[PDB]
Amino acid sequence: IHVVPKLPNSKALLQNGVPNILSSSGFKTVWFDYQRYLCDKLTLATAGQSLESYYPFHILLKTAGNPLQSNIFNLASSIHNNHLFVENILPSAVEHGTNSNAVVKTEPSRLFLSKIKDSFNGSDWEVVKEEMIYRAENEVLGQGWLFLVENNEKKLFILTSNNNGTPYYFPRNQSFDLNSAISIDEFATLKQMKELIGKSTKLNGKVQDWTMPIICVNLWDHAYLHDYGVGNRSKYVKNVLDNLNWSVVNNRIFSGI
């Protein structure tokens, strides 16, 4: 059985929500209700099978290449992504429930701000945030996820997913919406991806991708509607990126010590 992880300072979260982003009701929808909804569905889908003993991140990797396990993949991807989002927007990862700590001033580290300049042609963090807000509004028509990811070449770049698209495995990033029209450049990207997946010799037709997320923003209606409303998702993404927990985001960047 997959159970909803306990979050630090949960009593505060159930009373005052997440300050500057979500209210108490908004946080109950995104985490206490939706995470319960996902875990229960995952348990029903995977109970009695070998996947029941694997954590959601491993399930999505195991099932990423199986077309008829997409339902399990979607549930595992959403569960992993949601706790990635709830973790970097959380007031404090440490449990100051008995310490009553009210001073958590976390700021981008030097390694993060050094990789931002290197990967964005000298753009500042503030400018990159504006690009992230723009990318979310123009690339995610409906539900999806906004990620700041790091690849095998030490370069930070922006990835957006539609519905439950994993950042780890490019064949399942779901960054192109094929319901609408696509340019010849987008079709070239899809065609090149298909060729890479066909070069793999494995009988499971799987490729190697070492991309890892650094920041996760939930763009689903379960996270913003109640507090922001239809059409105000760009005000929600702005608040999330301005009140990130950088103790968690800094730890996600590999330092090498």
């Binding site: 997959h2 029941e52 954590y55 991140f57 569960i79 706790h83 095998n152 070492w210 590999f254 090498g256």
Partner: protein, 342 residues
Amino acid sequence: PNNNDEVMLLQQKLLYDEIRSELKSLSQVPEDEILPELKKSLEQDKLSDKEQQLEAELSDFFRNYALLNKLFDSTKPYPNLIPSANDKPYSSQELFLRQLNHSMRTAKLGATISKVYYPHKDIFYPPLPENITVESLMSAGVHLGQSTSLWRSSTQSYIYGEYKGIHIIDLNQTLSYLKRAAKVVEGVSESGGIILFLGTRQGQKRGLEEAAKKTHGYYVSTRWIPGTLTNSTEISGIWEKQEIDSNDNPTERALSPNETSKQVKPDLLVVLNPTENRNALLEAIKSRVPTIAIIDTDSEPSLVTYPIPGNDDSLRSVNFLLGVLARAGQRGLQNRLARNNE
């Protein structure tokens, strides 16, 4: 906040690589190119009061830590990683360490897993004998006996019934026998006796080794040499013995050859697969060594002092019963070491 501290080192580390790289560049250049021109400069130069300071400070600094020194004497993890340049992509080793970082923090985000059986935990987290239930025994498959066609009718009193062509062992009796056997292991462990764990079926070694480790006992997983107990001087006399205190620490006292040839008999023998270890069981009888064994429906109960009715064919059932006995021994060992402290 303190990143600069590491940055200060990395700066020196980079500088050191630069100095070494161009030290090797000058190792290729012929001496005829550098030496004569270098000497000529000195022939055209005059030492100054300051220059002379280093003329003798370096002579001693090099006659103290290079010539008149002792060449020998009578970030710790992964200290041999060769980091890649900040412009170059991650190396294979760095990607492995980058994945290990992800595995500790992120890889387990999203959900926790409850009420799922993990095979390794039977060996490393065995329950205490008092917390064992019929359900737990049944989950491990201890109730599944042999085919009714292979029944050894001397086990009749342990049988709960037959189902799907096999005899079902009565777990209520298994639990009572298991508790009695566990108390014996704890008693012998708390008394300082030698406990030997014998099992020669494939896959049992891991359980046998850990059981011996946590009870400070002994195990045999490969083959019981016929005569190990009755012919001990011809088989085990050559191997080394040691003296230990009440805390099981080696005293270090050298042993007289008289003390190193004497038979060292186990105080208790635990047998996972008695049907294939008749030799050991008979030697235990001859040597008056109490024995514990898992007795399946085709196994003779009277050949052992303390039988435990149960499936002996499944590694889960065997490791579950072995784990319980091993933890009972551990508690006896911990109670003996505690009474010595106080």
